[PDB]
Amino acid sequence: EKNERTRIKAQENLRRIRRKQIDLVLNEYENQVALEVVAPEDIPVGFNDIGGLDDIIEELKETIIYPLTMPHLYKHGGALLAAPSGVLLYGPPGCGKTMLAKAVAHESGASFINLHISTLTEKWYGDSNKIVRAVFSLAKKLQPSIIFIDEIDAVLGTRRSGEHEASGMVKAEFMTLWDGLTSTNASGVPNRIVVLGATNRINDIDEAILRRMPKQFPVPLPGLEQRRRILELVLRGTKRDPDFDLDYIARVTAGMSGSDIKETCRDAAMAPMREYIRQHRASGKPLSEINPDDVRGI
Amino acid sequence: EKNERTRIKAQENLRRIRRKQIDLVLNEYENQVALEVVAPEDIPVGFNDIGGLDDIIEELKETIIYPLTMPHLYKHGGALLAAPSGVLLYGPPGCGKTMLAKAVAHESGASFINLHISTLTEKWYGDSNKIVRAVFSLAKKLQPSIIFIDEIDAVLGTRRSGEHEASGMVKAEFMTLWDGLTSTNASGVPNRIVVLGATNRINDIDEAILRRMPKQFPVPLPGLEQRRRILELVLRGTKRDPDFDLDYIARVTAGMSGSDIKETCRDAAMAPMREYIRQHRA
Amino acid sequence: RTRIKAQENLRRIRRKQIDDLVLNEYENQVALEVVAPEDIPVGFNDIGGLDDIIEELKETIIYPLTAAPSGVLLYGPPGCGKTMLAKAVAHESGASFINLHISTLTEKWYGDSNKIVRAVFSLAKKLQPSIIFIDEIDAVLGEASGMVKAEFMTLWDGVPNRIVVLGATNRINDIDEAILRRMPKQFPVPLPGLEQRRRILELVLRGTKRDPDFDLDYIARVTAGMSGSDIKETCRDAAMAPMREYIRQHRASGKPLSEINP
Amino acid sequence: DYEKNERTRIKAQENLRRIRRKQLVLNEYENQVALEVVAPEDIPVGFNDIGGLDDIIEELKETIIYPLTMPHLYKHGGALLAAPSGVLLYGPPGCGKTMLAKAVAHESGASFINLHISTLTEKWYGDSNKIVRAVFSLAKKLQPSIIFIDEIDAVLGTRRSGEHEASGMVKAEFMTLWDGLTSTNASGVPNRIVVLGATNRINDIDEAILRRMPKQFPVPLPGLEQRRRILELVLRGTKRDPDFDLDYIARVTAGMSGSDIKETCRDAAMAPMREYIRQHRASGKPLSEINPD
Amino acid sequence: EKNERTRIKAQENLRRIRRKQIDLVLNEYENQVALEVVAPEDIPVGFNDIGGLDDIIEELKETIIYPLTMPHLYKHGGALLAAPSGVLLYGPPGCGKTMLAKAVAHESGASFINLHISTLTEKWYGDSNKIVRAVFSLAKKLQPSIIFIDEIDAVLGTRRSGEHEASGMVKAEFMTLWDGLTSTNASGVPNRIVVLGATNRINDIDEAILRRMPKQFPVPLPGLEQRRRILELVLRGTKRDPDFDLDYIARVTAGMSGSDIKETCRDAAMAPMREYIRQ
Amino acid sequence: NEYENQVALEVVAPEDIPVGFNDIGGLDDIIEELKETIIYPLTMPHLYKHGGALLAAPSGVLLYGPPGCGKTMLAKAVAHESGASFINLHISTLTEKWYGDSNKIVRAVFSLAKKLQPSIIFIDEIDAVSGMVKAEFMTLWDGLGVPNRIVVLGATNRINDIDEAILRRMPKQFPVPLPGLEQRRRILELVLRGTKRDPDFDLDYIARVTAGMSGSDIKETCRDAAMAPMREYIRQ
Ligand SMILES: Nc1ncnc2c1ncn2[C@@H]1O[C@H](COP(=O)(O)OP(=O)(O)O)[C@@H](O)[C@H]1O
Ligand SMILES: Nc1ncnc2c1ncn2[C@@H]1O[C@H](COP(=O)(O)OP(=O)(O)O)[C@@H](O)[C@H]1O
Ligand SMILES: Nc1ncnc2c1ncn2[C@@H]1O[C@H](COP(=O)(O)OP(=O)(O)O)[C@@H](O)[C@H]1O
Ligand SMILES: Nc1ncnc2c1ncn2[C@@H]1O[C@H](COP(=O)(O)OP(=O)(O)O)[C@@H](O)[C@H]1O
Ligand SMILES: Nc1ncnc2c1ncn2[C@@H]1O[C@H](COP(=O)(O)OP(=O)(O)O)[C@@H](O)[C@H]1O
Ligand code: BEF
Ligand code: BEF
Ligand code: BEF
Ligand code: BEF
Ligand SMILES: [Mg+2]
Ligand SMILES: [Mg+2]
Ligand SMILES: [Mg+2]
């Protein structure tokens, strides 16, 4: 058992040496959680990349990140003016949610970690709660640490019964360290830990935990202006302006969500590429030139 | 296994000394339960700064927390006139059942130990029952003690058929050491140990545990006066805006929880604060 | 292990003498569970007007050990005083009252999960009379749990050694029917009747005065539903009420010193 | 409790050596899928054995299977001109939905990985997700990779909150690894992993899974020409008689699937051999007759 | 735990030793179905015993068993002349829909493996799919492999929106392992394993499973002479009293489906038996 | 074989049964056909095996009619009559707890039966026999070189909606009419065998007093008028 745990420890120590740069002491449980500390330089989508929703970026930055990072600015107010306990981005499926949980991990600089729901559920008994305590132990040892759990309605969410007698503890031993008797320091700082969460079913997330994460922003499907921005941003790397008429495309795709505009642009961005390939299919060898032309998709 | 256990017992010694002094020995096995003894001065809350709850904040101070400390003035009776062995603290989420426990831990005087859920369920076989036993063996060593299992719905609960019976042995261990044949003392005192619970749904905690906790304090949602008090109480750091009328936001809450009110009042203190972004501008 | 065997020797001497014989180290560790008869303060008189199941015990269990069936069950639900009955039996029993403390059987080893099970019956064979009462018997008698269960049921039916089995499960009809059928007897403990609830009123009300409240007789009018534990907690509350009033009055001024009246 | 690991780990390397030698190190749960990759030389069918699907075989080849391999060809706007992260083959049961994926596992070149729904659902707690992030970690190691979940509407479905919670995490684990936070690289390349899915019932898969896989190819029943071509493809094992209108069978079918036609051809072809057996002969005989019905 | 698995391995080894010669490695899943491979000599019924449905027993002996065993004579065809991978025989309750399975298991070398519904339904999550997979992993390892799912309309069935979780991924996994990715071999052989489905109503079995059982032999009620055939065959070694014949009873037995005749005749068989007790 | 050991709690022993064959109420023709064709061939088959492969006892026998105790009494009695250990279904055990727990029970029942002597299985209040249990109960009753040597009995008030395929496999379906104007005399004699019968009138109006009820009022009248002249003898 030690032969595997040593390599594990070496890997997480390497990851944390890469992250911490601009050497902790770790037990075995939150050791393997150190593999989930996302390096902020490995998420190539900032806040200037996601168009459409902008006010949600406003209320997501100037009330969550400025409270977490640079807390001295929010000390004149007192104990109230701190970062909220947790955040939730609920809305229709496939519009900016997981991609807005990337810019918050790239520019925030708050020791972001992706929780990886599988790791919460361990096979041995009493090791699915050791990891739930470890995710907060490591979160506070390198605070201010943002935590993220995508799809929070399976690992979290309404119990409705004693499922398996091991899923009611991760739902409870998470809530015990979240906003429990040790959530506040001896002076008042609540450890500076904000757990995000993405979900399209807000009404299945254990409303007792709904009190836990109050900053719950609705992430609606993009409107007409939001789509006119998402087309401009998704169609950056495309020699697409012979006689391009984006006003028609941003209007016709009204009912379409914000994640299908990407695939629509993809089909409308490799159509002339397929034309060039089928043209070159006559003879020769694939040594692709840079002369397709995007005009109109479907 | 021993060196790491030696570090565990060393940290346990430090925490126990800082709790006691405000000297004893252990078995090198129950040290991992004294690593949750909450100190008295670190909990920054008290019974004075919790508006709303009044009959609870008085009934706890008179009936449970303070027949325990200074029990000499209740020594006229036998088993009676003693600390009631058990408390529940049930209520909806976000109404001050954890803050109440924090204030109890800070203003009690008994050796408050915070028994987590991850400290009872153990991987090795037979290493989860001897921790539930270590808890009640430590509570009796120094026995002003308020054990506190927060969120008693997973660690405890209605024992159903099967469901990892090794996890049912823990609840059986609680049932047998809590009020079993050796519950009280040979002199008659019931060891002066009062577990404090916490939950949002009193429907599956237990029927064989409700008897084991005679007190059940219902903490409901704050009404008119409770919200009027909590709104004034939360605004102790944030300076009051000039001409700001409190009763409007006080009455407009109208049944909202005791934490959502805190968030809506935090927004009203960050609103102007966020607005003054001029320092970088200038 | 040396400290373990030393404490074992001391506790077993204080149990037996009211001598001692050295035995296996994996069998001494269960010998630290022998509570002396003078350790329990309560007695038979501390039980209410039950005097039927306690009478059955007094006639059928303690007498033969002075044949004695091996196995006795406590059937009542939580609230009637199963553990209280067991504690009272342990006082006026005169035999060797040895509990189990199932955590003692549970061990993080492979070949040691059966040695303690052997050691319990071995020590029972060493000294008589003996008592192996195990509260919450529907906890351990549900490759380790099954092994310990099978080995316990193997040596369960070990003069028939003067060994007695007493069970106090909080719930029945879902409890070890393989061995529950083997045990001879089982005594149900129902809710308190009229005379039973009257005795419960008269017993717990021992230290408090007779006029701290309305009256004792009227309390035995709605307490029919509640059990012996809810009645005791309500009595504790009603007793603390007058002392509550007195302490609240004394809060006005004066050092918080004890008194000699409510 | 250790020999099972040794057996799977030794066979895990041996299975990978086959696909590797056709042209690495894995942890515990990755050995499960390590015994699960399909070598393209093993499957005996190719793209030229699926008739009538000239508009689906051509769109499963220009936009989903050949932006993926040789991605250097698509590097002008590579951030967007990549292979889709999944494909949904849906339609009437019995036409190509498994044959297309069987030929894609043969004539693609990518490390095709079948998913085998029984292996995702372990009886222990948490192994169902340890296998999901094992397959979505082996695909990244065997990149480029192609995952195929035949009949996706069984292992995946609408959440249905009042059901088994342990099976709502594997359905909520694809939404975390297959398009989650780490679906992209440090520069934009989304791991070059496409997940194939063939369901006989679309719209009962999910409201969120139907956006991950952006290429839902509907595979209709064989029309007037699909039957004509499937007859040609199927009746190439035994010789044909000098005169029989094979158009007649296709011209009269008009309502059968791609499997019903194969079964009818099987029933028709057995007539001459069963007649030769009616002649009570023991040895073989290379002549027969494939007359209509 | 381990001892139970070792005992199951001992049973499977004994059963394979007794069934193979009129032995291969097995896990603890396909071992569970190892106890289901019946011995041909156990079933005391042959093809000659079945009557009435004489034109269904013929097409099963020429298009299923012959294309399954000794296919070298059928090797002249490439792949079309293999055995049909699935066979269904439906009928009203009271006809020969199960006795045909016995005749196929007894007088046709097939490694007949009947799987019971309780051998598929299980308590642990993902333990039923790993048995549906073990079945087809065993049938491949010994592959005459005539699998027989009687009352298939229950173990399978119509898949709905509000369908049970565990019972919904065992219908899809089964029909995916039947005709799926690994259905064929490297050489292109169809991997001969036939599945016998014997249901009472082919209306709700599935829309995708009926194609997986292309041979659907209808088993109607016993015909006029067919009932006479069953009468003459069921009372071969029975009582032989004077001239009174079942042919008159055959005309009398207009209804009284084929299963019912086997008890009608036995009830009529106590005529000389009852008087023997009169001593 | 954990389930067959679990079902071993309901295997009533073939001996020490309350059968007492004469105690059953007045029922001759049904019991005549029973003792002639079912229980008789169960014992000493060597004297009944003159014809082979067909003289096995059919495992289908139904007792349909209003609810009562005679059908259950007859089921209890036939076991001791043929030296059979009564293994009741215990239909409340058919409730579902796990996914396939009940199907395991249905398998283990026939497992123990085939492993056991010719005792007969009983299904009290047959109404459950539409999932895997209902499927597998029709399968393992008759399925894949010796007869079953065990008969299944049918006891249920429900008729013509009881899965007629199961009705097909129930050859000797016997109507069990509990209310009988002649069986009532015998059952009242059975009752009054021990009860003191000095003051009460002759057993003639009893044949018309409990005319409506089938077999329950007669069973409750064992002590209905028994203690009526008995309270005074007990109080004084
Ligand atoms: N507002 C947006 N601006 C730009 N791209 C978007 C936006 N919303 C969705 N997308 C596209 O959707 C893809 C990821 O979708 P995602 O936001 O993860 O869905 P969900 O909202 O369910 O998390 C990205 O590739 C991105 O291009
Ligand atoms: N009675 C109260 N007065 C003031 N604030 C309260 C009160 N109850 C709860 N809160 C606020 O709620 C937060 C913690 O709530 P918590 O005690 O966890 O709710 P619950 O006890 O219902 O779980 C604290 O930050 C505190 O400010
Ligand atoms: N028969 C009785 N008469 C009077 N009081 C009783 C009786 N039984 C129980 N009690 C009271 O109720 C309480 C029951 O507590 P306990 O014996 O621990 O319950 P249990 O035995 O169910 O664990 C005792 O403290 C005792 O004072
Ligand atoms: N376009 C086609 N050309 C040739 N054969 C086909 C075609 N479509 C289906 N088939 C036949 O169908 C059989 C497999 O059907 P499959 O596609 O697996 O059905 P499903 O889509 O329900 O999985 C193969 O044996 C093949 O001969
Ligand atoms: N021709 C026949 N000869 C002998 N037995 C028959 C014949 N037809 C039906 N049976 C009997 O009828 C019973 C029921 O038929 P079966 O095929 O099992 O239908 P099901 O599967 O619906 O029960 C069988 O057990 C069989 O013994
Ligand atoms: F598609 Be996202 F991850 F909800
Ligand atoms: F939020 Be408390 F701990 F219920
Ligand atoms: F109710 Be106690 F556990 F006997
Ligand atoms: F494989 Be098919 F789509 F059932
Ligand atoms: Mg709280
Ligand atoms: Mg007790
Ligand atoms: Mg398929």
Residue numbers in the entry:
A (entry chain C): 44 to 65, 86 to 361
B (entry chain B): 44 to 65, 86 to 345
C (entry chain A): 48 to 65, 85 to 132, 145 to 220, 228 to 243, 252 to 355
D (entry chain D): 42 to 64, 87 to 356
E (entry chain E): 44 to 65, 86 to 342
F (entry chain F): 90 to 218, 230 to 244, 251 to 342
Task: Give excerpts from the publication.
The AAA protein Msp1 (in yeast; ATAD1 in mammals) extracts the tail-anchored (TA) membrane proteins that have failed to be correctly inserted into the ER membrane. TA proteins that escape this reaction are mistargeted to the mitochondrial outer membrane (MOM), necessitating their removal. This proofreading function is performed by Msp1/ATAD1, which extracts the mistargeted TA proteins from the MOM to facilitate their subsequent proteasomal degradation. Here, we present a collection of three high-resolution Msp1 solution-state structures (an ATP hydrolysis-arrested Msp1 mutant and two conformational states of wildtype Msp1) that address these outstanding questions and begin to explain how particular features, shared by AAAMC proteins adapt it to its particular roles in protein quality control and beyond. To obtain a homogeneous sample suitable for structural studies, we expressed the cytosolic domain of Msp1 lacking its 30 amino acid N-terminal membrane anchor (Δ30-Msp1) from the thermophilic yeast Chaetomium thermophilum.
We incubated Δ30-Msp1 with ADP•BeFx, an ATP transition state analog that in ATPases (depending on whether BeFx is bound) can mimic both the ATP and the ADP states, and Δ30-Msp1E214Q with ATP. 3D classification of Δ30-Msp1 particles generated two distinct structures: In the first structure the Δ30-Msp1 hexamer adopted the right-handed open spiral arrangement characteristic of AAA proteins (20950 particles analyzed). Refinement of this Δ30-Msp1 hexamer structure yielded a map with an average resolution of 3.7 Å, approaching 3.0 Å in the stable core, with most side chain density in the complex well-resolved. In the resulting model, six Δ30-Msp1 subunits (M1-M6) rotate and translate progressively to assemble into a right-handed open spiral, with an open seam between the top (M1) and the bottom (M6) subunits, similar to many other reported AAA protein structures. In the open conformation, we observed significant density for α0 in subunits M1-M5, whereas α0 in M6 was disordered. The α0 helices from M1-M5 are radially organized with their N-termini pointing to the spiral’s center and display a positively charged surface toward the face where the Msp1 complex would approach the membrane. In the open conformation, three pore-loops extend from each ATPase domain and shape Msp1’s central pore. Six pore-loops one form a spiral staircase around the substrate. In the open conformation, M1 -M4 were bound to ADP•BeFx (mimicking the ATP state), M5 was bound to ADP, and M6 contained an empty nucleotide-binding pocket. Upon loss of the γ-phosphate by ATP hydrolysis in M5, we observed that the arginine fingers in M6 become less ordered, as does the interacting M6 WD motif.
